[PDB]
Design a protein around this motif. Structure first.
Motif, mmCIF file in Angstrom:
data_model
loop_
_atom_site.group_PDB
_atom_site.id
_atom_site.type_symbol
_atom_site.label_atom_id
_atom_site.label_comp_id
_atom_site.label_asym_id
_atom_site.label_seq_id
_atom_site.Cartn_x
_atom_site.Cartn_y
_atom_site.Cartn_z
ATOM 1 N N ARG A 86 0.806 -1.208 0.000
ATOM 2 C CA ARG A 86 0.000 0.000 0.000
ATOM 3 C C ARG A 86 0.844 1.266 0.000
ATOM 4 N N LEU A 87 2.167 1.160 -0.111
ATOM 5 C CA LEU A 87 2.972 2.364 0.017
ATOM 6 C C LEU A 87 2.992 3.167 -1.280
ATOM 7 N N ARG A 88 2.832 2.510 -2.429
ATOM 8 C CA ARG A 88 2.617 3.233 -3.682
ATOM 9 C C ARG A 88 1.295 3.994 -3.654
ATOM 10 N N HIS A 89 0.242 3.321 -3.187
ATOM 11 C CA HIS A 89 -1.045 3.967 -2.966
ATOM 12 C C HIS A 89 -0.923 5.091 -1.948
ATOM 13 N N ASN A 90 -0.034 4.932 -0.970
ATOM 14 C CA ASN A 90 0.249 6.002 -0.026
ATOM 15 C C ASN A 90 0.937 7.180 -0.703
ATOM 16 N N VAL A 91 1.797 6.918 -1.690
ATOM 17 C CA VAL A 91 2.443 8.006 -2.420
ATOM 18 C C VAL A 91 1.412 8.789 -3.222
ATOM 19 N N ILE A 92 0.480 8.081 -3.864
ATOM 20 C CA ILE A 92 -0.525 8.814 -4.631
ATOM 21 C C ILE A 92 -1.538 9.491 -3.699
ATOM 22 N N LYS A 93 -1.763 8.947 -2.495
ATOM 23 C CA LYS A 93 -2.633 9.646 -1.548
ATOM 24 C C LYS A 93 -1.943 10.842 -0.910
ATOM 25 N N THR A 94 -0.622 10.783 -0.742
ATOM 26 C CA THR A 94 0.132 11.952 -0.307
ATOM 27 C C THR A 94 0.033 13.060 -1.339
ATOM 28 N N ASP A 124 -3.388 18.622 -14.766
ATOM 29 C CA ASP A 124 -2.256 19.278 -14.114
ATOM 30 C C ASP A 124 -1.587 18.354 -13.106
ATOM 31 N N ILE A 125 -2.370 17.819 -12.171
ATOM 32 C CA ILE A 125 -1.842 16.897 -11.170
ATOM 33 C C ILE A 125 -1.434 15.569 -11.807
ATOM 34 N N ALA A 126 -2.182 15.113 -12.820
ATOM 35 C CA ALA A 126 -1.940 13.849 -13.502
ATOM 36 C C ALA A 126 -0.593 13.845 -14.206
ATOM 37 N N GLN A 127 -0.420 14.726 -15.188
ATOM 38 C CA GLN A 127 0.862 14.858 -15.859
ATOM 39 C C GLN A 127 1.857 15.730 -15.083
ATOM 40 N N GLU A 162 -8.335 9.159 -17.868
ATOM 41 C CA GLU A 162 -9.296 8.250 -17.246
ATOM 42 C C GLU A 162 -8.746 7.560 -16.002
ATOM 43 N N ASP A 163 -7.438 7.329 -15.915
ATOM 44 C CA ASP A 163 -6.922 6.823 -14.655
ATOM 45 C C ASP A 163 -6.783 7.926 -13.619
ATOM 46 N N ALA A 164 -6.609 9.177 -14.055
ATOM 47 C CA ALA A 164 -6.753 10.303 -13.137
ATOM 48 C C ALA A 164 -8.188 10.434 -12.649
ATOM 49 N N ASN A 177 -15.747 18.462 -14.160
ATOM 50 C CA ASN A 177 -16.539 19.211 -15.142
ATOM 51 C C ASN A 177 -16.636 18.351 -16.395
ATOM 52 N N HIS A 178 -17.564 17.389 -16.353
ATOM 53 C CA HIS A 178 -17.561 16.272 -17.290
ATOM 54 C C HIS A 178 -17.826 16.734 -18.714
ATOM 55 N N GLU A 179 -16.745 16.936 -19.466
ATOM 56 C CA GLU A 179 -16.781 16.869 -20.920
ATOM 57 C C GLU A 179 -15.674 15.945 -21.410
ATOM 58 N N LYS A 180 -14.461 16.130 -20.875
ATOM 59 C CA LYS A 180 -13.332 15.231 -21.107
ATOM 60 C C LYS A 180 -12.471 15.125 -19.852
ATOM 61 N N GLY A 181 -13.074 15.301 -18.687
ATOM 62 C CA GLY A 181 -12.322 15.432 -17.449
ATOM 63 C C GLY A 181 -12.373 16.861 -16.921
ATOM 64 N N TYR A 182 -11.191 17.456 -16.697
ATOM 65 C CA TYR A 182 -11.022 18.880 -16.380
ATOM 66 C C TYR A 182 -11.746 19.311 -15.106
#
Lengths: 152, 38, 468, 55
Positions: free
Chosen positions: C369-377, C393-396, C404-406, C424-429
Motif C-alpha cells: 500500500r505504500l505506492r497507494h500512499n504516495v498517490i494519496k500523499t 495538471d496533477i496527472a501529468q 481516465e486513470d486520473a 466538469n464532465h466533458e473530457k475530465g477537467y
C-alpha cells in the motif's frame, strides 16, 4: 473453518464435526464463536439425537466466552453425563453456578407461597442427591444440613 | 525497562529536519535566470 | 574469591525477604496485596538481570545453588540458626575449595527443601525454591549442556504449574508475578530451538485455570505469551481475540499493558487498520515507561511507526534515533526519505536497495500500500492546495499520461473521502473547491463533551487513586 | 464449617455496609454544618471595623 462441512443435513456429519470438536476445540475457540447460531440449530432440532452433545459444546464455548446463564441453560440441556463428572474446572464451576441457581431458586420459591414455581428442569437434582450421598456417607452431616439451610 | 524481544537489537543538526524538508526544492541561478527567460 | 561475597550478600538479601518475609506476608496478609516483598523480589530479579545472577562464572564454579537450597524447615523459632548455617557456610568459597554442583546435581537439590521436613504450607516458598535457583540458569543459552537443563528446569516449573493448580489462598499474587517472567523465559527457551506445539495447550489450559478464582496478573501476561505466540508464527487465531475479547484487567504492571497495546497494535496493523492502530501505537508510544533500558524502544519503534509511514503525513522521524540505531536504519532513513519524495524509480530503488532489511521487518503490508500512499500523499497535498485544479495538471505532474486513470484516482479519492473535488464532465477537467467556512462553533462544543467528560473521568480516577 | 463459618461471614457485613453508607450522609451533614460555620465566620463583622494598631 469446520462448520461449513455440515451441508449434509443428517446428524451423521454433525458427529464428524463433533469428532473434530473434542479433538481441537481449544485451538478453534476462535472458530465456534461464529458457529453459536448453528449450535442453536443443533439444539432446536429434536431429530438431532446428539442434542446432548450440542448443549455440551455449547456450554463449553459459552464457558470460554464467559456466558453463564446460557451455560446454565445448556448445562441443563447437556444431559445425564453432565453432573457425574469429577473434573476440577469446567463441571464444578458450572454446577457451582447451577446449584447456586438451585438455592436462589429455592429462596425465591420459599418466598413464593404454595406453588406457582419454576419447576425442576429435568437435569437438576443429579449431584444434589449424588454428591449429597458423598457428604452423607463421608459421615459428616454438616453439608447435609447446609443444603437444608440453602433450600429454606 | 526493556523486558521484551527487542534486547535482540545543532549547527546544521538543528536545521537538518528542515534540510531534508529542503531536500526537494532547488537545493541551492535558474531562480535568477528565470528573470531573463521573459 | 573476594568478588563472590557480593553474590553471597545479595543472595541472602533476596531469600531473606522472599522466604522469611514474604512467607510472613503470606501467613496472614494480602488484603489486596500486602506481599510487598513480591515486588521487592521482582526488583531483585531485575537486579539479577542487570548483574550476573549469582554463579554463572564468578571466578569459581557452582557455589550457592548446592548451598542455600538445604534446610529451611519453618519450625520452632531457632530457624534463624538455619539462617546462621546459611551465613556461616560462606567459608567454603573464600577459604575452602569450590566444586561443581550445579546444572547436574540440582535434580535432588530441588527435592531437598521437600525431603528435609514438612517445611511449610504455602506455594511461594516452593515457587521460590524452583525459581530463585533456576532463573539464574536460563540466561546462558549457549546450547551446549545448558539448554537441555533450562528445558528440564522449566519442566520442574511445569511441576510448579501443577503445584500452582493443586496447592490446597491468593498466593497467585506472588506466583503469577514470578510466573510472568519465568513463562516468558519458558517461551524464550522453547523457541530458541523450534516452535512450541503442545506448550500452546499448556498455555491455553494455564489461561483457563486463571479465569475467575484467581484472576490477578495471570490472564494478561499469559495472553501476551499467546499473542506473541500467534505473532511469531502463522496468523489464524486473531479471530479468537475478535470473538473472546476478555482483555481488560486492572492493567497492573503499567508496562505490561503498554507493550500489550503495542503488540495488539501490530495485530491491527497487520489485520488492516490506520486509525485505531495508529492511536494505540501512539498510546503505547507515550506509554513508554522510561528510557532506563538502553536502545530497546528503538528497533521496536522502527516497527511501531510503520503505520505512520503508511499514513504518508509523516516527516522525518529523527527525534527517536539512537546513534547506534543509525547503522541499522541506513535503510529506514532513506525509506522515510522515500516517503517524503514522490519519485517512482526511487520508490522501487529503495526496495531494490534494502529488500533484505525489509524482510527483517517482514511486513509486505507496507509496500503493498505504500505506492497507494504516495498517490494519496499527492492527492492530500494538491487537493488541499488548489480550489479548482485540473486532473491533467496533477496527472501529468505525477506522470499519469491519461485522463481516465486520473478520473479513477479522483473517484477513489472521493470514495476514500478527502475533498469534494468533482469533474466538469466533458473530457475530465476537474471543477472543484476547498472547504473553509465548513463549521467552527457548535462543532467544537460537540467534542467538548468528550473533552470534559474525559476530564471528569480522570477526576474520579484521581479520587479512586486518592483512596489508596 | 462451610455451612456455618463461611455463612457467618455475612452476620456482620450488613451493619458494616450500613455504617459505610451512613458515613456518606454524615459527610453531607457535616458539610452542611461547615458551610454554616463559614457563613457565620464573617456576616456580622467588617462593617463597624474600629482601628487600633498592632503592638
Amino acid at each position: 473453518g469446520i462448520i461449513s462441512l455440515l451441508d449434509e443435513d443428517e446428524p451423521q456429519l454433525k458427529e464428524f464435526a463433533l469428532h473434530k470438536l473434542n479433538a481441537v476445540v481449544n485451538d478453534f475457540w476462535a472458530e465456534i464463536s461464529e458457529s453459536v447460531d448453528k449450535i442453536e440449530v443443533l439444539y432446536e432440532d429434536e431429530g438431532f439425537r446428539s442434542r446432548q452433545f450440542a448443549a455440551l459444546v455449547a456450554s463449553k464455548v459459552f464457558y470460554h466466552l464467559g456466558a453463564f446463564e446460557e451455560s446454565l441453560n445448556y448445562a441443563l440441556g447437556a444431559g445425564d453425563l453432565f453432573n457425574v463428572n469429577d473434573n476440577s474446572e469446567y463441571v464444578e464451576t458450572i454446577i457451582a453456578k447451577c446449584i447456586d441457581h438451585y438455592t436462589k431458586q429455592c429462596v425465591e420459591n420459599a418466598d413464593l407461597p404454595e406453588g406457582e414455581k419454576k419447576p425442576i428442569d429435568q437435569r437438576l437434582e443429579g449431584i444434589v442427591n449424588k454428591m449429597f450421598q458423598r457428604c452423607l456417607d463421608d459421615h459428616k452431616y454438616k453439608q447435609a444440613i447446609g443444603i437444608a439451610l440453602e433450600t429454606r | 525497562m526493556s523486558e521484551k524481544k527487542q534486547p535482540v537489537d545543532e549547527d546544521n543538526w538543528d536545521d537538518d529536519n528542515v534540510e531534508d524538508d529542503f531536500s526537494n526544492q532547488l537545493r541551492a541561478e535558474k531562480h535568477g535566470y528565470k528573470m531573463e527567460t521573459s | 574469591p573476594p568478588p563472590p561475597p557480593a553474590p553471597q550478600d545479595v543472595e541472602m538479601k533476596e531469600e531473606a525477604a522472599t522466604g522469611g518475609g514474604s512467607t510472613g506476608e503470606a501467613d496472614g496478609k494480602t488484603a489486596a496485596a500486602a506481599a510487598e516483598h513480591s515486588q521487592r523480589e521482582l526488583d531483585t530479579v531485575t537486579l539479577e538481570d542487570i548483574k550476573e545472577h549469582v554463579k554463572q562464572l564468578e571466578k569459581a564454579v557452582s557455589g550457592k545453588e548446592p548451598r542455600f537450597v538445604l534446610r529451611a524447615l519453618r519450625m520452632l523459632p531457632s530457624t534463624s540458626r538455619r539462617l546462621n548455617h546459611y551465613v556461616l557456610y560462606k567459608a567454603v568459597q573464600g577459604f575452602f575449595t569450590s566444586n561443581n554442583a550445579t546444572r547436574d546435581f540440582l535434580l535432588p537439590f530441588l527435592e531437598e527443601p521437600m525431603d528435609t521436613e514438612a517445611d511449610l504450607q504455602f506455594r511461594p516458598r516452593t515457587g521460590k525454591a524452583a525459581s530463585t535457583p533456576l532463573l539464574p540458569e536460563v540466561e546462558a543459552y549457549l546450547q551446549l549442556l545448558v539448554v537441555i537443563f533450562m528445558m528440564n528446569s522449566k519442566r520442574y516449573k511445569e511441576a510448579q504449574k501443577i503445584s500452582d493448580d493443586l496447592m490446597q489462598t491468593q498466593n497467585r499474587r506472588a506466583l503469577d508475578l514470578v510466573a510472568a517472567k519465568c513463562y516468558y523465559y519458558h517461551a524464550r527457551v522453547y523457541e530458541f530451538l523450534d516452535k512450541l506445539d503442545v506448550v500452546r495447550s499448556f498455555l491455553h489450559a494455564r489461561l483457563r485455570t486463571a479465569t475467575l478464582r484467581h484472576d490477578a496478573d495471570g490472564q494478561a501476561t499469559l495472553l501476551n505469551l499467546l499473542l506473541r505466540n500467534y505473532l511469531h508464527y502463522s496468523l489464524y487465531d486473531q479471530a479468537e481475540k475478535l470473538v473472546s475479547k476478555s482483555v481488560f484487567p486492572e492493567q497492573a504492571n503499567n508496562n505490561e499493558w503498554a507493550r500489550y497495546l503495542y503488540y495488539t497494535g501490530r495485530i491491527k496493523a497487520i489485520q488492516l487498520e490506520y486509525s485505531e492502530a495508529r492511536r494505540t501505537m501512539t498510546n503505547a508510544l507515550r506509554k513508554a515507561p522510561q528510557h532506563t533500558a538502553v536502545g530497546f524502544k528503538q528497533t521496536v519503534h522502527k516497527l511501531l511507526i510503520v503505520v505512520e509511514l503508511l499514513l504518508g503525513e509523516i516527516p522525518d522521524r529523527l527525534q527517536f534515533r539512537q546513534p547506534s540505531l543509525k547503522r541499522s536504519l541506513m535503510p529506514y532513513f532513506l525509506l522515510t526519505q522515500a516517503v517524503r519524495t514522490g519519485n517512482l524509480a526511487k520508490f522501487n530503488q529503495v526496495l531494490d536497495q534494502f529488500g533484505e532489511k525489509f524482510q527483517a521487518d517482514g511486513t509486505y503490508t507496507l509496500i503493498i500500500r505504500l505506492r497507494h500512499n504516495v498517490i494519496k500523499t499527492g492527492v492530500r497535498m494538491i487537493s488541499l492546495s488548489y480550489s479548482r485544479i485540473s486532473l491533467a495538471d496533477i496527472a501529468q505532474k505525477l506522470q499519469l499520461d491519461s485522463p481516465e486513470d486520473a478520473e479513477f484516482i479522483v473517484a477513489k479519492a472521493i470514495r476514500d473521502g478527502v475533498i469534494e473535488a468533482s469533474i466538469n464532465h466533458e473530457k475530465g477537467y476537474v471543477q472543484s473547491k476547498e472547504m473553509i467556512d465548513i463549521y467552527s462553533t457548535r462543532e467544537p462544543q460537540l467534542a467538548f463533551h468528550q473533552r470534559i467528560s474525559f476530564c471528569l473521568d480522570i477526576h474520579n480516577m484521581s479520587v479512586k487513586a486518592m483512596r489508596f | 464449617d462451610l455451612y456455618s463459618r463461611y455463612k457467618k461471614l455475612q452476620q456482620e457485613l450488613e451493619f458494616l455496609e450500613v455504617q459505610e453508607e451512613y458515613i456518606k450522609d454524615e459527610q453531607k451533614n457535616l458539610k452542611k454544618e461547615f458551610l454554616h460555620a463559614q457563613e457565620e465566620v464573617k456576616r456580622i463583622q467588617s462593617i463597624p471595623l474600629v482601628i487600633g494598631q498592632f503592638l
